[PDB]
Amino acid sequence: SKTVSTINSTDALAMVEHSSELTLSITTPVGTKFVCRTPFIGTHTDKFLLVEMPKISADDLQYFFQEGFWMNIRAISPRGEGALIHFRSQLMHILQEPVPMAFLSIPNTMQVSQRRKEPRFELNLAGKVLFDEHRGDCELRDLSRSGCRFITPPLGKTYQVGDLVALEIFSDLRGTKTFPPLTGKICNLQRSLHHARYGLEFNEEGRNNAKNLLAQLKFNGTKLTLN
Amino acid sequence: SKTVSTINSTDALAMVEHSSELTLSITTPVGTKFVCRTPFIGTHTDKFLLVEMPKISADDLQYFFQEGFWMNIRAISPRGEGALIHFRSQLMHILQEPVPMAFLSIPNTMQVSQRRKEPRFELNLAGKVLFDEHRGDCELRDLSRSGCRFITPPLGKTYQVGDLVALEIFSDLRGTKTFPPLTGKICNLQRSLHHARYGLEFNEEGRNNAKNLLAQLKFNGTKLTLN
């Protein structure tokens, strides 16, 4: 159900809401175990992870919360069905003024357990959605190896969960031609009179064409674009 | 289109993503105005709002960024159509170590500019959704003076945008009786094989039974409850 992978810390931490609770698990040099919880404050650029200083005892601070100690930290994300972010960081500084705060290092990567088994790439590619012999307009919004997200004019033809559609995405900026079709079934949808969005899960052929389409796209840093 | 209201700061800031950009506007006693932007780091409880030190001259820090100076701030929220949060804060401390940070006061309330015109209250009340004489199970998840959000079991009959339905919410813990119907039009829906959620807008009398239902409810700090 949950897939775990290694993600760069910036993207990992962007999934965590500021003020949410962090669970810090510490093991001292002699192996003494200690756990404490405290709110996440935020991050300064990529230099430090700031947390509210936990209310621990003087002995706790002395034996378990020393600058230089490394520790395992768990953070939660409430997005979708929810995800867990696990990483290891070193306690760098403790400030009592102007408010109690602890500064932890930000590692290069973190382990994320989430429901999505793979990433989805953002993009904006116009095309047509074929269903029951009829075509409507659509715009591809994200694409993964196994599916995609697309939107349509809210007043056009609507689709239902389970419907089998084929997305013919324009290969050129002139409309006319289209990449080999992305075929699959409607997995989810969100609609109103203002919006119509759909999550699609490809079938074998659709996966084949997705890989093909993806390969013909050039990245532009944040999104994929025609090329 | 955008409605402005005054919200407690904890809730307003929860709408802002850590690391997002803040726009700081400062006016000196002689009327010199300065505007700069810098990333929001987070907040320590309700004591301070932390931001990365804006990249500005000694000149500008001297005339516009002194401890004690007041400034009006604008933050962004990406939720839904997007929202703006405006508030006034006093610069309390500037720290250079271990990283450059400015500590601002957190006012009790903030002004939020958003698309929703009124608040929606969370709850969990079981009931039935009546449509063409048929009754499907449902759970009311939020309620406002003008509408509500409800979900149904995934295998339940699905409603379409524009459908006129009536929510018969159980008034007692044993089913049996219900509150006067919350009648209205399906405004939006999100659906998959495993979830079915709906946003509903009340008609005139429906708005009346919503007020009447609400008033018959007991508040419990976080959500409303029966009895």
Three-state SS string over B186-223 comes to EEEEEEECCCEEEEEEECHHHHHHHHHHHHCCEECCCC
- Count CB atoms within 10 A of the CB of residue B60: 14
Q: Rounded to the nearest 10 degrees, how much is the dihedral formed by the CA atoms of A34, A38, A44, A49?
A: 20
Shortest Cα–Cα distance, A157 to chain B (Å): 13
Nearest residue to B48 (alpha-carbon basis) of A166, A145, A43, A99: A99
Structure tokens belonging to residue B188: 């939006």
Closest CA to A126 of A156, A98, A144, A152: A152
Query: Alpha helices, DSSP H only, in chain B?
Result: 9-14, 58-64, 204-215
Mention every residue, 6+ apart, whose C-beta is less than 8 A from residue B215.
none
How far from B85 is each of A167, B76, B82, CA to CA, in Å? 39, 6, 10
Cis peptide before B78 (omega within 30 of 0): no
- C-alpha closest to that of B171 among B117, B111, B114, B214: B214
Q: Resolution, in Å, please? A: 2.1
Q: Which two structure tokens, joined as six digits, stand for A49?
A: 């992870």
Structural domains in chain B, CATH included, are 1-116 (2.30.110.10), 117-227 (2.40.10.220)
Among chain A, residues having any CB pair with chain B shorter than 8 Å are: 13-14, 16-19, 39-45, 47-48, 50, 52, 92-93, 95, 98-101, 103, 160-162, 187-193, 199
End-to-end CA distance of chain B: 37
- Alpha carbons B195 and A115: distance in angstroms, whole number: 15
Contact check, Cβ <8 Å, A40/B42: yes
Task: Say if residues A145 and A214 touch (Cβ distance below 8 Å).
Answer: yes
